[PDB]
Design a protein around this ligand. Sequence first.
Ligand SMILES: CSc1nccc(-c2ccc3nc(NC(C)=O)sc3c2)n1
Length: 795
Amino acid sequence: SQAFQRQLTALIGYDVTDVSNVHDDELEFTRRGLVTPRMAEVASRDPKLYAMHPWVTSKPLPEYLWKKIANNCIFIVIHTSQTIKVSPDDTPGAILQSFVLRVCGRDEYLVGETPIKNFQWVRHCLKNGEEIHVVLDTPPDPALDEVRKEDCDRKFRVKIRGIDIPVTVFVEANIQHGQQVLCQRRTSPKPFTEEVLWNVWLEFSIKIKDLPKGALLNLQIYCVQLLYYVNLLLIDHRFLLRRGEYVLHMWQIFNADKLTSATNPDKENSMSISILLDEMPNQLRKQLEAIIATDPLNPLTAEDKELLWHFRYESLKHPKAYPKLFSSVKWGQQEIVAKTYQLLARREVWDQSALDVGLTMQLLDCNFSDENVRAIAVQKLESLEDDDVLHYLLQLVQAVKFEPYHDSALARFLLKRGLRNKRIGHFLFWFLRSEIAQSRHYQQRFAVILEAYLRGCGTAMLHDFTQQVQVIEMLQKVTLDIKSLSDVSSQVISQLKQKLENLQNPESFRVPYDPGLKAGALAIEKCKVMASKKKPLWLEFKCADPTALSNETIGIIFKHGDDLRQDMLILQILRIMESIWETESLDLCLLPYGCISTGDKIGMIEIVKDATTIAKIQQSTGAFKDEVLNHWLKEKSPTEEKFQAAVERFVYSCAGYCVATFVLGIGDRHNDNIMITETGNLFHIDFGHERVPFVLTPDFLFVMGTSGKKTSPHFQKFQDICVKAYLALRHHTNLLIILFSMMLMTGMPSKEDIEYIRDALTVGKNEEDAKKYFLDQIEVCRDKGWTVQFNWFLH
Ligand SMILES: CSc1nccc(-c2ccc3nc(NC(C)=O)sc3c2)n1
């Protein structure tokens, strides 16, 4: 029967049928709309390849990795087991006749027409110098992917009737098109009582014909302080102007939440509003080019826009110009939007333009409501490969918040690519689910998209998702209860022990942050409760796969009290930073541990094996000491090779974070939050948690062979890597600025904050300046030594 809709609801965390919180039928129309994209991708997909999900690339194997193929040969261990020699560009389809190739312990298969070098797992191994273990296996049944069978010249105007609260005031109405205010009207102020009626007409100056699709009536209540906001889409999803009586429950108090077409579902408590609807000169060329060259966050003066619009067609031959050219369109004029479209009809240079993800992203941000503009960005995304889509997904998802309508190219794109690849499909799930679970502002839209995906991923995936949700809700329950019962107490660990007995009577589940890894039974004697302020559960599980090479059990932390959505975003940008460096033969040894937000200030975390905190390494002797980090680093490594590798790994990873963590503006971190692996790899944790640009303390320096006033061949390497790392990122200024900007608009608590990255990336500066800029930032750190780290102790 429809019991299927109940399980969907439970998977999704929201009931998409529930037609309570709607004043029109856009969500339903979208549920209906997304059926054919769902069905088309399901039909188009190859059952074999879809069943095995080969993680693959096209990108040229980086040089530093070819240095670990100094023989033109690669060792593979097939499983009693035997080693085999294989050429870099041999097919797994070929080396089978060398007498289905599945990775040991993992749900990862090596299949299809591509060199073995083009498989991510192979590239993962070479990076680490670990022998490729592959079980000789027969492919899983594609049958388990079974999908269940299913001309107006009048001026626009609005009647503000009044507002109502259950438990000095004026309404403001704005006709908005993507952050542009096309027109603005106010009501007369009135004493602020529970019910305040105006029954006024507000007549705008923008004529009805001049309303563009995607235009919001944004209603705001002021006391002067903004108190409550609400939005209604003036032109609706069927292409019809808004009409009729409307009662909208408003949100209580810049971020993506202010743009939503959703209404406050809390009717018991919320404020509501009743409304009623019934060829050029050298120099101008030089000025134009200087406009197009400016970073994405550099404001256009009115002189700029009139210029850009005038040389419209000449501006079109530059893709870098597109965000700027479409930010100069007067969307509140019918004749102009028309011209804009004759122009978009001949966007031929952009179609042939090599795909610029950074450029692409801009046309999807808060500043473009036109869906035809937004579509040309989505058009470029069509050519991205899976590996690429996986780098951008979290932020492509977040960009759905900026779409004016629930059904768009973007939402359809994420749907297609999720339906076409289990791994993308896996992450898409948890991303959407995380947003559905915690944003009242966007759950309705995100829930609809997630239904649309779950009704097409097939029964296997469906049952996969079932186990994970069951498990994470089971464990979440436990996570909160313990925080209620609290440094670490005595009963607490026994109380925990006893709770973990109750919830093992689902027996296997995919780790949400690494879908390749099966988590079997818990290891109940290994589970603890950490001594940090928020009392998170240290939990580990035995791997479900018997075909695993070892018994290194999977560790996952469960935490409530911090915004892991923020962690998630930072980490994604970290993976994008590695991705730039990789294309410039740079491995900065970033360790961006796996992490998913599952609810409100609550989620999960990848435990990185063989690592501790630098604060813990200091604790081991408030009176800090210089030597103990190098001392600790030695007493872990047996051989001199390993220690020399470890110290190098430190020099790269430290440079890596110093660059990353500086550019993102999260440099000034406490001791507790930086961690190092015994293998030398350093990494930061907790992003939901007299200044300094980045942590580079005298114990860090001591390891490089430096204290106070000194330098070493290993330290001069550090600066060499930094600078090179620093101007690598700078080559992708436009990309970074967008990602940063979108991360704030969709993930954090202002115009000011958005521009740290402009100062951090030093826009307008030449190359040799930036060299010196970062080198002097290194210098600043040497001075403060332990004063700032001591601050965080006092704090
Ligand atoms: C507690 S709060 C927190 N918040 C964000 C992130 C984290 C985190 C991440 C990774 C991580 N790896 C660890 N490895 C070992 C061996 O202990 S511990 C740890 C902790 N913790």
